[PDB]
Design an enzyme around this catalytic site. Structure first.
Site, mmCIF file in Angstrom:
data_model
loop_
_atom_site.group_PDB
_atom_site.id
_atom_site.type_symbol
_atom_site.label_atom_id
_atom_site.label_comp_id
_atom_site.label_asym_id
_atom_site.label_seq_id
_atom_site.Cartn_x
_atom_site.Cartn_y
_atom_site.Cartn_z
ATOM 1 N N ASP A 56 -9.835 -4.309 -5.527
ATOM 2 C CA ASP A 56 -9.377 -3.109 -5.176
ATOM 3 C C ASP A 56 -10.209 -2.247 -5.735
ATOM 4 O O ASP A 56 -11.461 -2.558 -6.050
ATOM 5 C CB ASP A 56 -7.737 -2.753 -5.500
ATOM 6 N N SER A 108 0.732 -1.086 -0.062
ATOM 7 C CA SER A 108 -0.187 -0.016 0.187
ATOM 8 C C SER A 108 0.793 1.499 -0.024
ATOM 9 O O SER A 108 1.628 1.466 -0.995
ATOM 10 C CB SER A 108 -0.915 -0.118 1.150
ATOM 11 N N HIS A 145 -7.752 -5.454 -0.714
ATOM 12 C CA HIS A 145 -6.409 -4.602 -0.162
ATOM 13 C C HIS A 145 -5.789 -5.234 0.997
ATOM 14 O O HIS A 145 -4.708 -5.255 1.132
ATOM 15 C CB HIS A 145 -6.644 -3.355 -0.108
#
Ligand code: NA
EC number: 3.5.1.9
Length: 300
Positions: free
Chosen positions: A245, A158, A277
């Site tokens: 996502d 991320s 995610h």
């Protein structure tokens, strides 16, 4: 807007927690998918050193939150390869206690694993957080050279995939020899082009990332001009996006992978079926999981 030509909402297409197919029995699935994330990962962390027989050394590369926890099994050689994980949380949240899901199976395959922490915005501008991360890269190579281990893999999730991406553009620190040591670079569901998200109060409230017209170049790996590409030719680069996502997230990964490939790096894009995610990290704590087997396959 840009990475999602079908876009309606940006505050939704920039919070991955909304694109999860999990917790759909719940009025706010997003709050559920975070509550779960925080809970299970902390559990994973306590289990490492309380039930899995794994040992931890508490080090730092800097003041306060700039910490490196080095996890190993004592039954394994000290010249083992080193796996480095750089955590997520939009530069505003997350810490070491939630960052160690990935450690157990890697130690069981004979790695030492370094899980690092960093300072958040707005204690630092993103731009400063990035020069601090440059210090951590220097530290981690300094540290591996100490132990004369000469094989490393980096992974970032991320915001940590974004932070990691500077390794390819800090040559005054990362020498050709240092580059030569790296087996793989793994970028899990990152952000690479900050141009859009910069103007949001939901993502960047009161401009805590301290961004502006002048440093947008700098903090966007997407936009850099890569040089001295040949020295990374021993390193495999894997840009991964999760199936569930945001569309913006997925295409950013896809384009970054393209930027990388066109510039002549050994990069590929993956869209990872069944993951969002978050569970894409949660499940790194399970040796048998899909994502685990993926990391295993990188080794051949
Ligand atoms: Na080695």
């Amino acid at each position: 807007h840009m990475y999602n030509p079908r876009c309606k909402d940006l505050d939704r297409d920039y919070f991955p927690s909304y694109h999860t197919t999990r917790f759909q029995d719940q009025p706010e699935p997003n709050l559920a998918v975070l509550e779960h994330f925080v809970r299970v990962t902390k559990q994973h962390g306590r289990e490492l050193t309380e039930k899995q027989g794994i040992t931890v050394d508490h080090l730092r590369y800097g003041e306060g939150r700039q910490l490196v926890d080095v996890f190993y099994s004592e039954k394994t050689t000290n010249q083992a390869p080193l796996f480095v994980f750089v955590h997520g949380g939009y530069w505003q949240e997350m810490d070491m206690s939630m960052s160690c899901s990935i450690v157990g199976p890697l130690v069981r395959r004979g790695y030492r694993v370094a899980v690092m922490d960093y300072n958040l915005c707005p204690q630092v501008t993103l731009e400063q957080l990035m020069t601090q991360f440059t210090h951590f890269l220097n530290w981690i190579f300094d540290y591996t050279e100490m132990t004369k281990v000469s094989s490393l893999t980096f992974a970032g999730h991320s915001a940590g995939a974004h932070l990691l991406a500077q390794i390819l553009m800090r040559p005054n620190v990362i020498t050709a020899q240092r580059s030569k040591m790296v087996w793989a670079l793994i970028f899990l569901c990152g952000v690479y082009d900050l141009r859009e998200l910069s103007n949001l109060e939901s993502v960047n409230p009161k401009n805590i990332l301290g961004l502006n017209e002048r440093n947008i170049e700098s903090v966007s790996p997407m936009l850099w001009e890569y040089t001295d590409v040949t020295v990374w030719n021993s390193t495999k680069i894997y840009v991964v996006a999760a199936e569930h996502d945001s569309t913006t997230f997925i295409e950013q990964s896809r384009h970054y992978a393209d930027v990388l490939r066109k510039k002549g790096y050994k990069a590929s894009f993956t869209l990872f079926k069944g993951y969002d995610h978050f569970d894409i990290i949660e499940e790194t704590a399970i040796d048998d999981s899909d994502v685990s087997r993926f990391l295993r396959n990188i080794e051949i």
